[PDB]
Symmetry: C2
Subunit: 390 residues, 2 copies
């Protein structure tokens, strides 16, 4: 009984931790005999062991012990890694691992106050530096009365914290001018929380005369995105008079035409704003916010991409073909979107972009492991297969 190696435990394609947190990653594979594990930089070069920063356990595991703020080296803490299992029969490398370590430092948050018409919906977002935006999210909003607000179901009450962390207020009025809100932020890696410094207030203006609807950007296009099985937000910010009614439509694929969105238990609209409770890849497409009014109307396009995890499967996982015959391999994948598709043999980065691999004629040199690679900007996945000779 003998066969090549196969990846069982693959490190997460993206890993985030602080300097004080440290990290451990383990790629675990099985094969007969036991394959040897190695780590490599994105360019394929074998990793060196760096004292105090990056070191191989030799157990098939790798670690980044905690380190001083000054001990940070880019080539280590910010890099794309991967795991390589190899033996007599062949070799395979694990899906790309993004290692990102953030040395702990304090940040700040500001809230831009938005002028709003009486009766129209209003929203206050907590502005954050784009660089740490990955690692931090808004935990809650707190009123000057001391009461705090958190995201949830039940979109009633006029006060709701959306999944984006943006505080939404429907049907505003002068009564809402007194109170002022500030947002709480929670850093994922640290777990520490910080409350907004600047106190966001909402200034309402009593409209005089009729005025057509207006968007706060004037750009007719935006590109949204989101993970499947999560609350999604398609926002429309338009202040206008008198008191617009809003309608959202979905374009049919590659069509100038469109059909109206179905408002139901799952898909909900809050006064300007669509929400998808649990998203699926089918919801992806071009969206349109149509906001009308007595005087006139205005429109905004929104591009939505629903993300799904990537996973690959090669078929058959193994086979044996006689000399002078066609070899066949079929890569079956799941997840969306998908941009890159490629192949390789014991590494070597061979092939082209097709879901299928074929060798017109078997040859002695074609034995060993084969691997299918599919991935997008944000993710990656792989599957392994062996080829015996007959």
């Amino acid at each position: 009984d003998q066969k090549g190696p196969v990846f069982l435990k693959e490190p997460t394609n993206r890993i985030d931790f602080s300097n004080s947190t440290g990290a451990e990653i383990e790629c675990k594979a099985s094969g007969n005999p036991m394959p040897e594990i190695i780590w490599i930089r994105s360019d394929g070069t074998a990793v060196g062991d760096v004292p105090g920063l990056r070191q191989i356990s030799s157990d098939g595991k790798l670690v980044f012990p905690p380190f001083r703020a000054e001990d940070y080296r880019q080539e280590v803490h910010a890099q794309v890694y991967a795991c390589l299992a190899r033996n007599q029969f062949g070799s395979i490398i694990s899906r790309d691992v993004h290692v990102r370590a953030v040395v702990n430092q304090f940040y700040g948050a500001d809230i831009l106050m938005e002028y709003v018409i009486r009766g129209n919906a209003a929203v206050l977002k907590c502005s954050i530096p784009s660089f740490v935006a990955d690692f931090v999210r808004v935990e809650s909003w707190i009123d000057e009365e001391g009461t705090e607000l958190r995201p949830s179901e039940n979109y009633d009450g006029k006060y709701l914290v959306l999944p984006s962390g943006e505080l939404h207020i429907r049907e505003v009025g002068p009564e809402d001018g007194y109170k002022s809100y500030q947002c709480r932020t929670k850093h994922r890696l640290t777990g520490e929380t910080r409350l907004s410094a600047t106190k966001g207030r909402l200034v309402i203006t009593e409209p005089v005369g009729s005025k057509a609807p207006t968007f706060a950007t004037a750009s007719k296009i935006s590109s949204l995105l989101g993970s499947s099985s999560s609350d999604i937000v398609l926002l429309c910010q338009a202040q206008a008079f008198p008191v617009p009614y809003t309608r959202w439509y979905k374009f049919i694929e590659g069509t100038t035409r469109k059909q109206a969105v179905v408002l139901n238990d799952r898909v909900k609209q809050v006064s300007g704003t669509l929400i998808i409770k649990d998203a699926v890849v089918e919801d992806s497409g071009k969206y349109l916010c149509v906001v009308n009014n007595s005087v006139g109307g205005e429109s905004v396009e929104t591009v939505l991409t629903v993300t799904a995890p990537l996973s690959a499967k090669i078929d058959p996982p193994t086979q044996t073909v006689d000399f002078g015959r066609p070899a066949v391999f079929t890569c079956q994948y799941t997840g969306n979107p998908i941009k890159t598709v490629s192949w390789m043999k014991d590494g070597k980065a061979i092939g082209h972009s097709e879901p299928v691999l074929r060798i017109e004629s078997v040859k002695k040199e074609d034995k060993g492991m084969y691997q299918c690679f599919v991935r997008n900007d944000q993710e990656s996945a792989e599957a392994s297969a062996e080829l015996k000779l007959g």
Copy 2:
């Protein structure tokens, strides 16, 4: 010598004025006999006199005298008008005249604090409510020190103001975090000037460790509009460490292919910000802002549409065709963009949308005026033509 009606002086499409200013619009026409001029709603009814708010001068001129806010009336000041010149042979309308009177009313502004890392450029936008965006723009920027700044030519040195009104700063450092800036907004109709209450200041983050590039939006697409001969701003908000090199590209029309942008005296790139002086229709197209560095890169694409003044020409201006013979009118227009091209006869909407219309068989009933209507989401224009029977 008999002639059909023709326009000499035609009103401008867009007319905005303050309640305290008041305005007068004029329509002039020619042809023998001299046409009968009538001011009418977009809807075909004769405009009647209203006391003090709206008055028709005996010379064929419409006027809207000043008034107090309490005397504001929607059906007059918010109404869309048109001029109808008429003769025995037929009649023609003018370009759509949008009358909008703004009852003098207050606005405000707030400056979001721009979070930045050392060495990277900074951009302070003066935020303005969506409704007054068209009536208000930023004239100048005043610092904490009280020094004043304007959107001068010679893009160089540290501080710069862009034509779009954003305050730009390069090579930011801790020394520049102490200062606090205030924009200056000027209402175009009244000429009133407001100095922002909120004082924008920059939070400077000492770089610690390497950080992949990040955009302040996370949107991959915007869309910008600007007139020809005016300076346009394509801007990249990406923050990255080590300080990234940025480059702009322009997609080929309808292709995934791309080409680099030509830099010159006219087109000058400031940091991540691309500027196009004296824009022309040829500049319209999709653009791509690319930002890279030792860690990686990220990009966003921007759709640009350059407007051009709409003007229409009909050929032949006049003709005569016998019964049974075909009639032909070619409307050749100017400007950009182009949404619809329509046709009317004697002030009646008919037919289809084409640059050309032909009557396969002429009839006595086809005697009359024909006009070509071109439009976009912003502007409109008209052209007139005579048709006589042989």
